[PDB]
Design a protein around this motif. Structure first.
Motif, mmCIF file in Angstrom:
data_model
loop_
_atom_site.group_PDB
_atom_site.id
_atom_site.type_symbol
_atom_site.label_atom_id
_atom_site.label_comp_id
_atom_site.label_asym_id
_atom_site.label_seq_id
_atom_site.Cartn_x
_atom_site.Cartn_y
_atom_site.Cartn_z
ATOM 1 N N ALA A 54 69.892 -109.809 -30.089
ATOM 2 C CA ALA A 54 68.824 -110.941 -30.225
ATOM 3 C C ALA A 54 68.140 -110.509 -30.147
ATOM 4 O O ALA A 54 67.186 -110.544 -28.850
ATOM 5 C CB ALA A 54 70.312 -111.633 -28.628
ATOM 6 N N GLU A 55 66.688 -111.712 -30.495
ATOM 7 C CA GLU A 55 65.656 -112.239 -30.191
ATOM 8 C C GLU A 55 65.566 -113.186 -29.158
ATOM 9 O O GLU A 55 66.236 -113.945 -28.353
ATOM 10 C CB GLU A 55 64.508 -112.570 -31.420
ATOM 11 C CG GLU A 55 65.534 -114.545 -31.118
ATOM 12 C CD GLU A 55 64.814 -115.100 -32.747
ATOM 13 O OE1 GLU A 55 63.494 -115.525 -32.339
ATOM 14 O OE2 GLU A 55 65.554 -115.415 -33.485
ATOM 15 N N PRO A 56 64.212 -112.524 -27.833
ATOM 16 C CA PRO A 56 63.927 -112.378 -27.339
ATOM 17 C C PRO A 56 63.053 -114.564 -26.505
ATOM 18 O O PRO A 56 62.537 -115.004 -27.562
ATOM 19 C CB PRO A 56 63.056 -112.341 -26.572
ATOM 20 C CG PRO A 56 62.057 -111.075 -27.602
ATOM 21 C CD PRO A 56 63.126 -111.383 -28.234
ATOM 22 N N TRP A 57 64.667 -115.319 -25.933
ATOM 23 C CA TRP A 57 63.744 -116.527 -25.851
ATOM 24 C C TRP A 57 62.981 -116.738 -24.569
ATOM 25 O O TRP A 57 63.716 -116.395 -23.760
ATOM 26 C CB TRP A 57 64.756 -117.830 -26.069
ATOM 27 C CG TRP A 57 65.515 -117.423 -27.141
ATOM 28 C CD1 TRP A 57 64.749 -117.537 -28.489
ATOM 29 C CD2 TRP A 57 66.610 -119.216 -27.658
ATOM 30 N NE1 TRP A 57 65.009 -118.689 -29.204
ATOM 31 C CE2 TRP A 57 66.370 -118.889 -28.757
ATOM 32 C CE3 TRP A 57 67.277 -119.807 -26.356
ATOM 33 C CZ2 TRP A 57 67.563 -120.198 -29.225
ATOM 34 C CZ3 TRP A 57 68.526 -120.217 -27.546
ATOM 35 C CH2 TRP A 57 68.485 -119.986 -28.796
ATOM 36 N N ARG A 58 61.857 -117.813 -24.837
ATOM 37 C CA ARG A 58 61.037 -118.230 -23.921
ATOM 38 C C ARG A 58 62.101 -119.880 -23.054
ATOM 39 O O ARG A 58 61.128 -121.074 -23.746
ATOM 40 C CB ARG A 58 59.895 -118.050 -24.004
ATOM 41 C CG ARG A 58 58.706 -118.473 -22.571
ATOM 42 C CD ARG A 58 57.443 -118.508 -22.728
ATOM 43 N NE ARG A 58 57.528 -116.818 -22.038
ATOM 44 C CZ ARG A 58 55.644 -117.235 -22.039
ATOM 45 N NH1 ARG A 58 55.021 -117.616 -22.459
ATOM 46 N NH2 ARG A 58 55.043 -115.827 -21.352
ATOM 47 N N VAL A 63 64.214 -129.017 -22.461
ATOM 48 C CA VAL A 63 63.843 -127.163 -22.503
ATOM 49 C C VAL A 63 63.276 -127.121 -24.158
ATOM 50 O O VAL A 63 63.969 -127.543 -24.870
ATOM 51 C CB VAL A 63 66.113 -126.508 -22.620
ATOM 52 C CG1 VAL A 63 64.403 -125.135 -22.807
ATOM 53 C CG2 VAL A 63 66.104 -127.243 -21.321
ATOM 54 N N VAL A 64 62.173 -126.273 -23.469
ATOM 55 C CA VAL A 64 61.217 -125.482 -24.475
ATOM 56 C C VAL A 64 61.762 -124.537 -24.849
ATOM 57 O O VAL A 64 61.222 -123.627 -23.542
ATOM 58 C CB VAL A 64 60.041 -125.972 -24.261
ATOM 59 C CG1 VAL A 64 58.583 -125.862 -25.285
ATOM 60 C CG2 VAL A 64 59.048 -127.584 -24.104
ATOM 61 N N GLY A 90 58.192 -115.156 -32.276
ATOM 62 C CA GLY A 90 56.977 -115.473 -33.265
ATOM 63 C C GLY A 90 55.592 -116.609 -32.493
ATOM 64 O O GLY A 90 54.556 -116.685 -32.900
ATOM 65 N N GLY A 91 56.681 -117.229 -31.220
ATOM 66 C CA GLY A 91 55.429 -117.902 -30.644
ATOM 67 C C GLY A 91 56.409 -119.054 -30.963
ATOM 68 O O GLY A 91 55.231 -120.590 -30.827
ATOM 69 N N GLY A 130 50.804 -112.564 -25.557
ATOM 70 C CA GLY A 130 50.927 -113.725 -25.611
ATOM 71 C C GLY A 130 50.691 -114.473 -23.692
ATOM 72 O O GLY A 130 50.195 -116.401 -24.293
ATOM 73 N N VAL A 131 50.000 -113.248 -23.252
ATOM 74 C CA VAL A 131 49.494 -114.050 -22.100
ATOM 75 C C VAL A 131 48.082 -114.590 -22.401
ATOM 76 O O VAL A 131 47.570 -115.723 -22.152
ATOM 77 C CB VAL A 131 49.063 -113.619 -21.013
ATOM 78 C CG1 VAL A 131 48.743 -114.426 -19.442
ATOM 79 C CG2 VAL A 131 50.804 -112.972 -20.417
#
Lengths: 6, 29, 85, 164, 69, 97, 114, 51
Positions: free
Chosen positions: D35-39, D60-61, D66-67, G21-22
């Motif tokens: 699974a792709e990482p989520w921030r 929740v953002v 890919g940003g 990304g920082v």
């Protein structure tokens, strides 16, 4: 009915 | 079609009826 | 030297021109023409005005609204749905 | 973190957020290791009583690989559940922030190597500090979740000002 | 006693306003010829504010939620 | 009978849970919109690959905690009709009041 | 007077050892600045829009101004007693009521005589 | 019951949200009588609220 209506 | 065509006579009638209803609410008060 | 900056006089000149647009013979002629058009339209209609001032709410829309509202409110009972209304 | 333009960011459903949090939860049956990482950045409104555009719950953002940033509006608490609840609720529109916080709590649970067969039974003494404490653990969400903070929105209007 | 039949028979849910405990107390008072049984309950219902704790609650008697726990 | 009836607008078309589950599993439903005060009704917007194209169906359910593990398991995006523009319009109305 | 050379006062941060990304790009900085600028005036803009709607209604009433341009209406006379059917009758009217009516009419017209 | 302290009497008890109460009453042989509970709360509690 009503006097002012007519 | 009909989008702002079935609305404008109805909104016109609603505005007129609302104004006359406010005047008649003053009358009955 | 120049006190004309921050033009309160120029923003009040709009109100002065607005006041000067009326109270003239052109505006009196326009008002008399509008009185003629109002008189013509009032003689033309003569039925729609009675429909909208007397009939449309009190004898067309309001009885429908109160009957639908009562039947939507009261329980499904013979007395409350037929005899009491 | 700067509170983003909510009216311009793409929106993501609370159901989709819950499914992604379950997929990044190693304790759940729907776990996906690939699974792709989520921030995840959780925002609480601080202009609810000072501003006029305030919102009651959380936002929740979610930043993807890919940003790309989407947002989730957890405006109301859904089916109130404990943090250890794993069953999805009936009628998915009952997914509020309670289920999201339960999944966030469950994700960050430590994962242990299979030394419990030598630790839950053990030999003698203080086994929890002589054979378990020298056993380590893998987090598992730190390579798939960020949840990097819980932020608050800026309040440009002072609560006791003439503008307020 | 319970007025649970009232909605399906008349349309008015009198069980929302009927007091079965007060009816039971009235029935017991009538049966035993002891009117205090009904009168005390009726007066407690009417003068409820005067039944609020005015003894042992003097001058900001708040403990806490945590101390209560 | 689409070749026999006349066209009459586009009304919803009440389905059932079983029908919706079948067309969700077969990958014919593109988006779901849970509605109802009790949240037990669904507007199902189907995709163009479905046998019938895009149709806005209406489904009524029992409370079964397996809807999510079918919809998001296959392809379906859940959504609500209240966007941020509608929320800001509501805030404007509150300000006018 | 101490000097404290700048190598003990300045940060030697190299934007290479930072995590990916920082370091914010120019597009990200522009987006953040736009979001800050919008959040600094959003409530003011919405309150101004609501007050502007109310002011537009008030200015429309001001352009209405008085009675000019409006025809007399037989369905709406200027007196509610004309509109309804309200007349005084045998019970209630008494001679002194003329005096009280005179005083009320003097006060309503705005004259301090009685 | 008549074996209760104070004889046989009727007592009104207001309950907290206790999920074990019904199980306790059932397992202790108590006749649990609910009553009616009409579904349409809006329609049922309308005329009595007007009153």
């Amino acid at each position: 009915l009503n006097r002012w209506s007519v | 079609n009909y989008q702002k065509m079935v609305a404008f006579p109805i909104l016109l009638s609603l505005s007129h009826l609302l104004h006359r209803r406010i005047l008649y609410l003053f009358d009955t008060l | 030297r120049a006190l004309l900056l921050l033009p309160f006089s120029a923003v009040g000149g709009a109100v002065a021109a607005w006041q000067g647009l009326f109270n003239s013979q052109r505006y009196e002629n326009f008002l008399m023409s509008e009185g003629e058009r109002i008189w013509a339209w009032r003689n033309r209609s003569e039925n729609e005005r009675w429909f909208w001032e007397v009939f449309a709410w009190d004898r067309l829309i309001f009885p429908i609204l109160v009957i639908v509202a009562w039947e939507y409110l009261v329980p499904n009972h013979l007395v409350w749905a037929v005899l009491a209304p | 973190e700067v509170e983003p333009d909510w009216r311009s960011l793409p929106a993501m459903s609370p159901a989709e957020l819950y499914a992604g949090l379950r997929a990044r939860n190693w304790t759940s049956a729907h776990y996906d290791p690939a699974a792709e990482p989520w921030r995840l950045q959780v925002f609480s409104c601080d202009y609810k009583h000072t501003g006029v555009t305030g919102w009651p719950g959380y936002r929740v953002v979610v930043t993807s690989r890919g940003g790309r940033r989407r947002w989730v509006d957890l405006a109301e608490e859904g089916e109130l559940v404990q943090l250890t609840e794993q069953a999805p609720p009936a009628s998915p529109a009952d997914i509020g922030y309670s289920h999201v916080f339960a999944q966030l709590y469950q994700a960050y649970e430590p994962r242990y190597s299979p030394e419990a067969l030598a630790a839950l039974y053990g030999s003698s003494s203080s086994k929890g500090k002589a054979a378990a404490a020298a056993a380590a653990q893998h987090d598992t969400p730190a390579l798939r979740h960020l949840d990097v903070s819980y932020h608050g929105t800026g309040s440009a209007v002072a609560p006791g000002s003439g503008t307020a | 006693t319970y007025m649970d039949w009232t909605y399906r028979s008349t349309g008015v849910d009198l069980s929302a306003v009927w007091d079965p405990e007060l009816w039971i107390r009235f029935r017991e008072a009538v049966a035993q010829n002891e009117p205090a049984i009904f009168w005390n309950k009726l007066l407690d219902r009417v003068q409820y504010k005067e039944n609020l704790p005015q003894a042992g609650l003097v001058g900001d008697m708040r403990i806490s939620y945590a101390k209560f726990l | 009978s689409v070749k026999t009836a006349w066209r009459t607008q586009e009304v919803l078309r009440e389905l059932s849970y079983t029908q919706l589950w079948a067309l969700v599993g077969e990958g014919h439903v593109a988006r779901v919109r849970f509605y109802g005060p009790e949240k037990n009704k669904v507007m199902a917007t189907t995709r163009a690959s479905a046998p019938g194209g895009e149709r806005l169906c209406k489904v009524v359910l029992p409370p079964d905690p397996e809807l999510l593990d079918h919809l998001v398991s296959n392809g379906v995006v859940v959504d609500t009709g209240v966007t941020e523009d509608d929320r800001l319009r509501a805030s404007l109305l509150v300000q006018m009041l | 007077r101490e000097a404290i050379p700048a190598e003990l006062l300045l940060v030697k941060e190299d934007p290479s050892k930072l995590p990916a990304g920082v370091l914010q790009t120019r597009e990200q900085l522009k987006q953040a600045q736009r979001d800050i600028n919008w959040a600094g005036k959003r409530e003011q803009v919405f309150a101004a829009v609501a007050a502007g709607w109310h002011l537009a209604s008030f200015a429309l009433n001001l352009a209405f101004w008085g009675v000019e341009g409006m025809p007399p209406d037989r369905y709406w006379p200027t007196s509610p007693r004309i509109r309804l059917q309200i007349r005084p009758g045998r019970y209630g009217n008494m001679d002194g009521g003329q005096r009280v009516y005179m005083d009320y009419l003097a006060r309503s017209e705005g004259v301090p005589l009685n």
